[PDB]
Design a binder for this molecule. Structure first.
Ligand SMILES: *[C@@H](C)[C@H]1/C(=C/c2[nH]c(/C=C3N=C(/C=C4\NC(=O)C(CC)=C4C)C(C)=C\3CCC(=O)O)c(CCC(=O)O)c2C)NC(=O)[C@@H]1C
Length: 172
């Protein structure tokens, strides 16, 4: 799995022509590791081999990854702010998306992304069945706006890998 993804991180990078793209896996204990990482003009250091703490993300945000399955961050310059809400469990049967064309994130990510010197941040969740196995993310300088039409093409690209990582769990 970790090896296979190594070729995926670079493969997708070619398509998304993103300078930096890495895959993030998750553990039940609340621990995640980077099993892949690519760099373009080497504007950022290699994070590969670094374990990220779950605390980095609560849950309400991850929920969107389950229902929204889109994950898109606008220019951190727009300074969008999104925090928690008072008693807002939101009861629904099953309505995919049904939210703004963008996903504002608390100032937590603002500095986080900016700290990486990345104005843009394209993310894509990798879920198999009803569970989440991995997470795809991309970061780079102003890569011009993104089209929804082209986004879909990649949206499926994230689904394909979902099969590779899933089929890998069996063998691995
Ligand atoms: C802020 C000081 C602290 C913090 C809190 C925090 N994070 C989020 C949301 C996200 N954080 C990430 C982080 C990553 N990007 C990556 O590339 C990686 C490695 C693969 C990570 C871990 C992401 C993707 C999100 C989701 C936002 C999006 O739309 O993409 C939140 C929001 C939760 C909410 O809804 O309240 C918060 C509060 N993260 C830190 O690192 C600090 C400790």
């Amino acid at each position: 799995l970790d090896q296979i993804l190594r070729a995926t991180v670079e493969e997708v990078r070619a398509f998304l022509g993103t300078d930096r793209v890495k895959v993030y896996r998750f553990d039940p204990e609340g621990h995640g590791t980077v099993v892949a990482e690519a760099r373009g003009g080497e504007r950022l250091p290699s994070l590969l081999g670094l374990t990220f703490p779950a605390g980095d993300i609560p849950e309400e945000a991850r929920r969107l990854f389950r229902l929204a399955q889109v994950r898109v961050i606008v220019d951190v310059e727009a300074q969008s702010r999104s925090i928690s809400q008072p008693e807002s469990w939101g009861l629904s049967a099953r309505v995919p998306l049904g939210e703004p064309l963008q996903r504002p994130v608390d100032p937590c990510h603002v500095h986080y992304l900016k700290s990486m010197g990345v104005a843009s941040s394209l993310v894509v969740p990798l879920m198999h069945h009803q569970e989440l196995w991995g997470l795809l993310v991309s970061h780079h300088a102003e890569p011009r706006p993104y089209s929804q039409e082209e986004l879909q093409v990649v949206q499926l690209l994230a689904d394909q890998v979902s099969i590779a990582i899933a089929q890998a769990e069996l063998s691995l």
